Design a protein around this ligand. Sequence first.
Ligand SMILES: [Mg+2]
Ligand SMILES: [Mg+2]
Ligand SMILES: [Mg+2]
Ligand SMILES: [Mg+2]
Ligand SMILES: [Mg+2]
Ligand SMILES: [Mg+2]
Lengths: 142, 143, 171
Amino acid sequence: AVVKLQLPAGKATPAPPVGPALGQHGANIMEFVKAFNAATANMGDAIVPVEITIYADRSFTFVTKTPPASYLIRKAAGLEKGAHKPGREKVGRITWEQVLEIAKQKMPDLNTTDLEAAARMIAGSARSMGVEVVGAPEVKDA
Amino acid sequence: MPNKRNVELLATLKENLERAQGSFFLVNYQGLPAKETHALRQALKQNGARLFVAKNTLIRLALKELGLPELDGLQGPSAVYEDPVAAAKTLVQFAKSNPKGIPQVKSGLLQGQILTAKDVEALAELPTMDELRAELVGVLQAP
Amino acid sequence: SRIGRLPIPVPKGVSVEVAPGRVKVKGPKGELEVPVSPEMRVVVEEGVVRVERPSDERRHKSLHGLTRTLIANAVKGVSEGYSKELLIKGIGYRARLVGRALELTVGFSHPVVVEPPEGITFEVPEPTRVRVSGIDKQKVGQVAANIRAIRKPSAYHEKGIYYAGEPVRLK
RNA sequence: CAAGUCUGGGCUAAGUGGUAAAGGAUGUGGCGCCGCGAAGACAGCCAGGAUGUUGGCUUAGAAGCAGCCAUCAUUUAAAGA
Ligand SMILES: [Mg+2]
Ligand SMILES: [Mg+2]
Ligand SMILES: [Mg+2]
Ligand SMILES: [Mg+2]
Ligand SMILES: [Mg+2]
Ligand SMILES: [Mg+2]
């Protein structure tokens, strides 16, 4: 449906693809290049999702519920500036300390909330990137 | 004839027949337009409060198992349910009614021990007979 | 499984005669003879008409489905047997009616004057679209074929005479 | 053109007969096996097939569908970034 973005880290850029293309999209853009600009302000770039909605007429909808899947990754986790040939070298290795509860922010909506869920969800473009990282030394069944 | 493990741990796991006593049990399908109802894929980490599969597998032959008396709501057998939080909170947590949110959810069959019919209208429309039972403390005979 | 040969068709305002090698349908829109095989009893019943076959071997089965679908089709025939869209996409291209006859222009040094054969009737409401009123089925599907064949429908460009779908367009 | 339009059973629709092979083929008839199926198979058709997502790597952008690739991981009737 009605979906696109506005980014990258701070000092929002409505560039030729990122917000001047608001015509037959929502079109009240003088005061709402400013009510999103505190909803992606002072957070830091790694991905920062943008949720945008549909209407009968012209304005006023929600923003986002979580920035996962490469974000709580390349702040300090997994040292994952995960260099080209995406990496069978350990471009950076961790455990589930900067992955599992760095974001219980994940819990708004990925449909599974208890944390072997959206924790290991975001260990998808983090953990299985070549070096499937680790959640433990493999629980020791007994 | 594998009778595939799709039937084996999904043939009830003999659960909800013995789980959240296996009766009061009632109406309403294996699925229609997927937008709305919800706590679909959200009942905290499971779908312990919904179901998964298989009208032909269980309901045709599963058996009589585990009960409470007779019947009859609106109609009879084609697709059914799973929960502990029945008639009162069966409907402050799910499946509002008439038509519904999405486009008008449809049909099923029940059996508890409260003697009678439909299960939609009088029993299942956020009926607060919990907050209208401090109405009975002086009713029907008192001076 | 589930063969097109031996279901049972339909009633209600239509006739049936069974000559030994032809069935005469003759419903409200006109009549249709059906040349039919002289094997295959075609037995008529109450408001239905089944066909059974003398053996169950590969060569008798193919003839069975055919002669069912051949009759059934003549029964929807004598009730709303017409069809066939012909949306005329492309720029200079416009069809129009004159007489009982269709005259369409799809970019030659002349318009092409089709005339309708019997049991066929031309309609061009909204002249980038032209429908074929037909009783038969197969004469209908033919005259629509022929009409379409006059212009392309390329294949590099959305101009020509189109049935339905198909943006094909190679580049 | 002398003597069977002889008698029973089945095959072939090519005028094969009245021919030339590797090789091919839902021609056709017959004998087998094996897979899946009335706790419901194969056709169809009815319904749904995602999110965070843009996967990362490259990048006016590839956001499955320009790609070289880690192609995840939950979830779940069921859905491959
Ligand atoms: Mg002689
Ligand atoms: Mg003879
Ligand atoms: Mg010859
Ligand atoms: Mg020859
Ligand atoms: Mg050979
Ligand atoms: Mg064969």
